[PDB]
Amino acid sequence: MPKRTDIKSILILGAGPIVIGQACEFDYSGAQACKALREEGYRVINVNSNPATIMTDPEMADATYIEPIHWEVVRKIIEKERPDAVLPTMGGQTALNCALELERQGVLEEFGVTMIGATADAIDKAEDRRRFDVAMKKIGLETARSGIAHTMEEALAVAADVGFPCIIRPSFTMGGSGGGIAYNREEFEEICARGLDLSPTKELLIDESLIGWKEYEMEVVRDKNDNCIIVCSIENFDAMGIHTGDSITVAPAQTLTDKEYQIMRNASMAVLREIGVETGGSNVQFAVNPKNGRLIVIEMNPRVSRSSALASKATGFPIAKVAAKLAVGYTLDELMNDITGGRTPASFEPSIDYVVTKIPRFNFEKFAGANDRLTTQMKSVGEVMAIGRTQQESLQKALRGLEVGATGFDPKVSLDDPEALTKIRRELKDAGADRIWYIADAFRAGLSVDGVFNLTNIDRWFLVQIEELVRLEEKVAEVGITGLNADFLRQLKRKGFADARLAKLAGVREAEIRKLRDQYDLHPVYKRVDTCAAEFATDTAYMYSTYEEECEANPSTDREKIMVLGGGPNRIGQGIEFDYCCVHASLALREDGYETIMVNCNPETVSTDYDTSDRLYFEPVTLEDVLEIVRIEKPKGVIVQYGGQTPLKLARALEAAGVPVIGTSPDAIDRAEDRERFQHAVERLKLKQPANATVTAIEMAVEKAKEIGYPLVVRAAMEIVYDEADLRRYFQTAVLLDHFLDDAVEVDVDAICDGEMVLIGGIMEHIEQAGVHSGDSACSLPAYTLSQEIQDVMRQQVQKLAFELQVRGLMNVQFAVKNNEVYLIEVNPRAARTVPFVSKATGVPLAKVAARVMAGKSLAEQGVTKEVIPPYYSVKEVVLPFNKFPGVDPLLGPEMRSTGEVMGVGRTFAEAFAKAQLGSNSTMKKHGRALLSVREGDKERVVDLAAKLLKQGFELDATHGTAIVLGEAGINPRLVNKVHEGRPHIQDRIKNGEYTYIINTTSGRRAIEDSRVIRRSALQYKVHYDTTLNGGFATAMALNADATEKVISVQEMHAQIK
Amino acid sequence: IKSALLVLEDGTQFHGRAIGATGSAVGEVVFNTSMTGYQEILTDPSYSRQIVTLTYPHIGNVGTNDADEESSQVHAQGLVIRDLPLIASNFRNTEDLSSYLKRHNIVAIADIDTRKLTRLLREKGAQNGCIIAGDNPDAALALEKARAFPGLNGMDLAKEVTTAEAYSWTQGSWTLTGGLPQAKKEDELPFHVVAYDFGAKRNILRMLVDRGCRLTIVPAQTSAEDVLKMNPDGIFLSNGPGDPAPCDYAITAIQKFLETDIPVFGICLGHQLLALASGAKTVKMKFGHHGGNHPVKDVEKNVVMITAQNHGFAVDEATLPANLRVTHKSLFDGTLQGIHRTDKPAFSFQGNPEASPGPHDAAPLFDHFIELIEQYRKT
Ligand SMILES: Nc1ncnc2c1ncn2[C@@H]1O[C@H](COP(=O)(O)OP(=O)(O)O)[C@@H](O)[C@H]1O
Ligand SMILES: Nc1ncnc2c1ncn2[C@@H]1O[C@H](COP(=O)(O)OP(=O)(O)O)[C@@H](O)[C@H]1O
Ligand SMILES: CC[N+](CC)(CC)CC
Ligand SMILES: NCCC[C@H](N)C(=O)O
Ligand SMILES: [Cl-]
Ligand SMILES: [Cl-]
Ligand SMILES: [Cl-]
Ligand SMILES: [Cl-]
Ligand SMILES: [Cl-]
Ligand SMILES: [Cl-]
Ligand SMILES: [Cl-]
Ligand SMILES: [K+]
Ligand SMILES: [K+]
Ligand SMILES: [K+]
Ligand SMILES: [K+]
Ligand SMILES: [K+]
Ligand SMILES: [K+]
Ligand SMILES: [K+]
Ligand SMILES: [K+]
Ligand SMILES: [Mn+2]
Ligand SMILES: [Mn+2]
Ligand SMILES: [Mn+2]
């Protein structure tokens, strides 16, 4: 019943770097589990290669390991810490996969580690698709007609049997990874080869189509006494055929009769019982034929998931925390319900009095050639959530919270466009990321609810609500601001219309609608989340806005409050890193005595965990929403510097409206963010910046260009133009102009200014040269090649910039070093994404420190005045989503595409880099054949790389001019033909597995376009590849290290710091 | 603009919109937390003279259908919701909810802050209220009617919704596939249970049938003698509206059955009566239990079941005579949920094992009954 006694220490496996399909939700879950276990008295050990997580913060656990999530590495941790048990259900597919390998490898046996939460067998039963299917049949649940395949031949025969289109689902994958929908054979082979390959068990399940049926999911929790509860139900908005992760979804279910719901609830339970999950949570997914209620079991996830995080946020029932406790022996009835002030137990089914909506965040604009249609394989990079008393209020709020610039149903096509209905039709029929907008456009263009349904399969119950919102909008447009009487506006507000959407329709400024509401005293009220539809009281201040009567905010008059603004959904370049800082602001300030108020709506995060702060407002981070909160909270100060771009952009507006913004001023922010304003301060400071120019006209550039000197960084999506012709060519296709600093080292420096002094947090040398976005660059702390001398120049400049721009809290500075000269690239007057890594690396929690500075405690008062240089090296490496978008050229450049990062800790740089590289899922080997194909600039240094590879045992292949260069130096690689040259060529060789390493560098649009085949193959074929010579050298160095050799804990790391 | 308004005994007003019949409704206002099953709730006799507030905001999403009816009519005095959807959207739907309410002549209001309402009821306890839906709703009038309501405490409503004459029931449960099945032939049912109609849900009846019973529903007021005269294999005490305390007839009859060896099983009102007939005492809860997510533990098995609840009165554990042993309790508040006669084959459950709407978790209570039944037959 109560806590297990034969277990003292638990190893928790983390999820690794954030990638599409496996994101922040695992930092939230992992953190909750550390939390619960530590509270319960267990000794906690955990491994997670991603430094940007709260779960890896040293005070969160007993032995924290920021090391590559490899079995051999984990093997060393077990050996070293000797955990009695392992909890592998809080780290995504990464953890499940690892647990099972450890098991397979016999490591568990080896050290007598007991698997808790979920057994190995149970996990496999759910994870192996064939096993899963047999089990459903065993319990009389129905599944789609299908066939298992382990090879292409078997695969064809299944298709031959189910017909097109068919759904391909690999075993041992999640988030639609390695799968898809085949409309034809061609696509069938493509998807099929992909998943057999990606499937850890080389297995695919091929099913007949159920595209268009309704999609549902249930979150279940089961304890050892067999007690079983439904924590939340979710109805998808997008139908079957579009992955749940890439679908808009809402809770609770809406269109099922109680009769139908009971059957699904009963089937959900039966499924857990059958698979054998006896001590945790699981997600069961189903398909429902809207025509006759026919129920089909689609799958089950024996662990915490992105839906379970959403469900916790939605209901206030902390699934991961509960599950952790169950894993060690507790039963639901023994645990107390968190938010009901521990008054009721955890053994109950939550009841909510509101509607929860989740909308996915996409970033197709960063992936040009990518197929931007929605399918069974996730493509989204994040998600936002909204709570409203109604579905319309919920939806709209979510729409404005998505950070895509929408104010709600903003139009996509013009009323007067002759082709709009055709475009509308296409977007509906074949869902893209923009579908929702197009739906409203459809209603404005004349299609009926029925016509829309027909194209989309989205339930009419939703469609009608959106239609109703459109008609209301048409009314606003007609009546205008004059017709915005108190009754109507209130109506509008109740349906979730935003002041900004109303303002566009009425042709006035947002502020005008805002005043109007003030005049009429029309403000939202706040309701609290409480798991039980007000049946019991609550003491947690977990809130959402709504246009209702009674307000439950009940703010303190007692305390000095500090508000922290979140970043909204995660997207490329605005990830978990911003959230870590928000969380830290909150933890430090609360610890210090302030009443902390968090404002954010990312359901995946720790910032939105009601434990993180005193008060949580789960709202869109917009000017409207914020002012409403500030209105009633009257805080001492507001932090806008930690949430990324989102809150950064509200700064001035917030100050204009009288909000007490703390830390670096909105003006200051602007000075740094405005290029022009920035260029003058640099000048003022007498610093060095590359030559630049603002060109309007083409012919105005071409000249100015001559002025600046090529190459040039065309920045309206950046570009590096090499020549005059290049320039034109650009514009054509296509304004600032900056001289591109060719072959320079890029560096980032994070720091803190308190008006009195500057504290250097860290100097990070990037591996990839300037021109490769810093977010996509691997980097090292401390610098691995920069002279202390030039580093001193940077520290000075950082200092001068800090004081000049009046920074108060964090800042980030980016330089480019060329010919022993420091050039300023930019100043980011807020927390940068490098903050968590620098903090982990140096043991100083810079976001807590900088937050104290913001609230008024100086560096000196806090005792943080000296730069810390660690005794070991920390290397950061990133993970790119290219494998999710095959049509894209997996090439680095000036624009950021990575989703996450990992950290490598070593005695030497080679050692850190090797850990970083392994942690990043690199397929690099220590032997084999390497293919070298480099650009002219690279021709010189390539020789040295080639010998290092030779010295290591590799054989070499080279294309034409590279072979020439190598030849002349004495290296004679095996010559290989380019695709044009003849056969066999690179493609063939790569396809055949001839290589284990590929080094391919290029320069010039055209040159890049041709060589596309190499990277594309390399990625497709899983061969490790570098696209920069600097990276190649870094890879060469790591060949000398052994990532599995030694492991170190964060506590130990930090203890080595003198 | 079809106005409506609800007023509680305390003076609180909620102005919204009329969504059912024109008129007024008076009763005790209660809240129900069920996210699905509004139709079933509406048609449960137990809701007699009560004004039902549903906390789940969208009520009506799936429309209505005959199979979802718990009785021949809508018993709820009135309906209080936050939002009526534009459309009903479900393959089983036969009529939109507004139409349905109108058709049943029900006074209903939408667009009010149901949360505020639930919070008041929770905090200050149950209150009587009144809804007026019409041209220009009289707030003073509504308050007066609310205040003039007698109240459910001491009110016998069982006699009021009971059948007039006894009847036979032999119809089992619905299936997705076959819907409601045809009534069975008496010879196909091994057992014969006599059911006391105190405002019985059809689902109770159907679940008994599913377990081998053939029944004879009898009016609330049936005598023990006439009852025993039927030679039943068991006796069933249905659920039903109002205060159980006043039903002196039932109590007496019951006491009468307890002298014999016939298995007796009560559900809800049936649970309270058994308790009363055994020397226990009933109380009116602060707000009671209405929802479908209520945890009740089988203490003899140390196990939890999520159940459907719909009761405003309860049995005091503290006054339990010695012959009554406690079998289940609420995990939300510890109230008494089940009892069993130590000396007789008589037991009851406060919650609704038949659900409709709700979790199927407590179905098994029915099996114990059969068990008892068969045992009595062995004799
Ligand atoms: N027979 C099917 N027809 C159509 N779509 C399907 C079918 N089976 C699954 N899908 C779709 O594919 C998605 C992914 O399948 P799922 O089994 O959940 O794999 P994953 O484990 O990757 O999340 C579902 O969310 C659903 O929209
Ligand atoms: N003048 C330049 N020379 C070389 N590389 C540059 C130059 N300007 C920018 N870059 C490259 O472009 C990247 C992004 O430019 P930056 O001004 O920092 O844009 P962002 O605001 O997107 O962070 C840098 O990290 C760098 O690799
Ligand atoms: C989901 C993340 N991976 C599969 C589990 C691939 C990036 C980690 C190895
Ligand atoms: N730090 C970026 C990842 C490097 C990738 N292997 C490439 O060099 O293209
Ligand atoms: Cl592994
Ligand atoms: Cl995966
Ligand atoms: Cl079908
Ligand atoms: Cl109007
Ligand atoms: Cl940043
Ligand atoms: Cl693609
Ligand atoms: Cl109201
Ligand atoms: K053990
Ligand atoms: K699965
Ligand atoms: K099947
Ligand atoms: K879907
Ligand atoms: K799911
Ligand atoms: K770089
Ligand atoms: K920037
Ligand atoms: K109202
Ligand atoms: Mn899955
Ligand atoms: Mn899935
Ligand atoms: Mn930058």
CATH of the domain at B203: 3.40.50.880
Distance from first CA to last CA of chain B, Å, rounded?
Answer: 67
Mutate which of B59, B80, B293, B329 to disrupt the A interface (most A C-beta within 10 Å)?
A: B293
**How far is the alpha carbon of B377 from chain A, nearest alpha carbon, in Å?**
33
| Angle formed at CA A399 by CA A395 and CA A404, multiple of 5 degrees | 165
Q: Confirm or reject: Cβ of A712 under 6 Å from ligand 4.
A: no
> In 10 A of CB A675, how many CB atoms?
15
Method used to determine the 3D structure: X-ray
Domain boundary among A531, A553, A575: A553
> In 10 A of CB A977, how many CB atoms?
16
Helix (H, G, I), strand (E, B) or coil at A617: strand
Q: How many CA atoms within 13 Å lie on the side-chain side of A457? A: 20
Amino acid identity, residue A126?
A
In-domain check, residue A954: yes
Q: Is the bond into A870 cis (omega within 30 degrees of 0)?
A: no
Q: CA B222, CA B158: separation in Å to the nearest integer?
A: 12
Q: CA A22, CA A879: separation in Å to the nearest integer?
A: 12
Helix (H, G, I), strand (E, B) or coil at A825: strand
Residues B171, B97, single domain; the answer is no
Domain boundary among B150, B184, B210: B150
CB-based contact A713:A740 (threshold 8 Å): yes
Domain boundary among A184, A210, A236: A210
In-domain check, residue A1033: no
Residues A904, A777, single domain; the answer is yes
Domain boundary among B150, B172, B190: B150
Report the Cα A491 to chain-centroid distance in Å. 36
Residues B350, B295, single domain; the answer is yes
Note the maximum CA span of chain A. Answer: 86
CA of A890: how far to CAs of A897, A1012, A1020, in Å?
A: 10, 8, 10
Q: Is the dihedral of CA A341, A346, A348, A353 positive or negative?
A: positive
User: How would you classify the pairing of strands B264-267 and B234-237?
Assistant: parallel
Mutate which of B34, B36, B44, B58 to disrupt the A interface (most A C-beta within 10 Å)?
A: B36
Residues B136, B184, single domain; the answer is no
CA of A1040: how far to CAs of A123, A907, A913, B148, in Å?
A: 37, 13, 10, 90
The per-residue b/e assignment along A1011-1040, b for 16 or more CB within 10 angstroms, e otherwise, is: bbbbbbbbbbbebbbbbbbbbbbbbbbbbe
Q: Which position has the token pair 């084999």?
A: A928
Residues A422, A517, single domain; the answer is yes
Closest chain A residue to B173, measured at CA? A259
Q: CA A522, CA A519: separation in Å to the nearest integer?
A: 8
Residues B313, B361, single domain; the answer is yes
Residues B251, B131, single domain; the answer is no
Residues bordering ligand 7, an ion, CB closer than 5 Å: A 289, 294
Residues B352, B206, single domain; the answer is yes
Residues B157, B177, single domain; the answer is yes
> In 10 A of CB B300, how many CB atoms?
12
In-domain check, residue A1040: no
Residues B108, B113, B116, B122: what is their CA dihedral angle, to the nearest 10 degrees?
30
SS (H, E, C) A774-790: HHHCCEEECCCCCCHHH
Distance from first CA to last CA of chain A, Å, rounded?
Answer: 46
Report how far ligand 12's centroid is from the alpha carbon of A118 (Å). 14
- Per-residue tokens: A219: 């979150």
CB-based contact B300:B340 (threshold 8 Å): no
Residues B166, B129, single domain; the answer is no
Q: Which position has the token pair 């960084």?
A: A713
Residues B208, B350, single domain; the answer is yes
**How far is the alpha carbon of B97 from chain A, nearest alpha carbon, in Å?**
13
Name the B residues in 154-213 with CB < 8 Å from any A CB: 174, 176
DSSP string, A136-181: HHHTT----SEEEESSHHHHHHHHHHH-SSEEEEETT--TTTT-EE
Count of structural domains within chain A = 8
CB < 8 Å to A352, chain B: 35, 56
Count of structural domains within chain B = 2
- Read off the CATH number of the domain in which B93 is found: 3.50.30.20
**Where does A668-732 show beta strands of DSSP type E?**
692-694, 712-715, 718-721
Residues B319, B185, single domain; the answer is yes
**Which has the closest alpha carbon to A932: A850, A1003, A997?**
A997
- Residue A461: give the domain boundaries: 404-553
Residues A512, A620, single domain; the answer is no
Residues B310, B347, single domain; the answer is yes
**DSSP label of B185:** P
**DSSP label of A761:** E
Resolution (A): 1.8
In-domain check, residue A1053: no
Q: Confirm or reject: Cβ of A1026 under 6 Å from ligand 4.
A: yes
Q: Do B92 and A333 touch (CB under 8 A)?
A: no
Q: Confirm or reject: Cβ of A22 under 6 Å from ligand 3.
A: yes
CB-based contact A1049:A62 (threshold 8 Å): no
**How far is the alpha carbon of A624 from chain B, nearest alpha carbon, in Å?**
23
Q: CA A402, CA A420: separation in Å to the nearest integer?
A: 25
Residues A668, A817, single domain; the answer is yes
Q: How many residues does chain B have?
A: 379
Residues A60, A37, single domain; the answer is yes
Residues A818, A748, single domain; the answer is yes
In-domain check, residue A759: yes
In-domain check, residue A606: yes
**Which has the closest alpha carbon to A67: A49, A50, A44, A83?**
A49
> Which residues touch A964 (CB under 8 Å, ≥6 apart)?
none
- Per-residue tokens: A221: 């929790």
Residues A874, A751, single domain; the answer is yes
Residues A425, A514, single domain; the answer is yes
Residues A426, A527, single domain; the answer is yes
Inter-helix orientation angle A835-842/A846-854, to 10°: 110
Domain boundary among A553, A587, A609: A553
Residues A548, A455, single domain; the answer is yes
Report how far ligand 21's centroid is from the alpha carbon of A243 (Å). 7
Residues A626, A715, single domain; the answer is no
> In 10 A of CB B139, how many CB atoms?
16
Q: CA B162, CA A907: separation in Å to the nearest integer?
A: 85
Q: CA A554, CA A540: separation in Å to the nearest integer?
A: 11
Counting ligands in written order, the one closest to the CA of A84 is 12
User: How would you classify the pairing of strands A355-361 and A541-546?
Assistant: unpaired
CB-based contact B309:B294 (threshold 8 Å): yes
> Which residues touch A440 (CB under 8 Å, ≥6 apart)?
A409, A411, A466, A469, A470
Name the A residues in 197-226 with CB < 8 Å from any B CB: 225-226
Q: Tell me whether residue A792 is exposed, middle or buried, using C-beta atoms within 10 angstroms of its C-beta: 0 to 12, 13 to 18, 19 or more.
A: exposed
Q: Is the bond into A555 cis (omega within 30 degrees of 0)?
A: no
B105 touches chain A (CB under 8 A): no
Amino acid identity, residue A116?
I
- Phi, psi (rounded to 5 degrees) for A203: -145, 135
Q: Classify residue A864 as left (phi > 0), alpha (psi -120 to 50) or beta.
A: beta
Residues B85, B209, single domain; the answer is no
Helices (H), A824-886: 835-842, 846-854, 859-862
Q: Is the dihedral of CA A285, A289, A293, A297 positive or negative?
A: negative
Q: Which position has the token pair 């749940």?
A: A244
- Residue B54: give the domain boundaries: 1-150
In-domain check, residue A889: yes
Q: CA A776, CA A368: separation in Å to the nearest integer?
A: 17
**DSSP label of A412:** S
Helix (H) or strand (E) run with residue A492 in it: helix A486-494
Residues A966, A1016, single domain; the answer is yes
| Angle formed at CA A166 by CA A162 and CA A170, multiple of 5 degrees | 110
Q: Among A49, A50, A70, A97, which is best to mutate for testing ligand 3, by the most ligand atoms less than 8 A from CB? A: A97
In-domain check, residue A852: yes
Q: Which position has the token pair 């510097």?
A: A641
Counting ligands in written order, the one closest to the CA of A300 is 13
Q: Do A254 and B61 touch (CB under 8 A)?
A: yes
Q: CA B188, CA A1004: separation in Å to the nearest integer?
A: 86
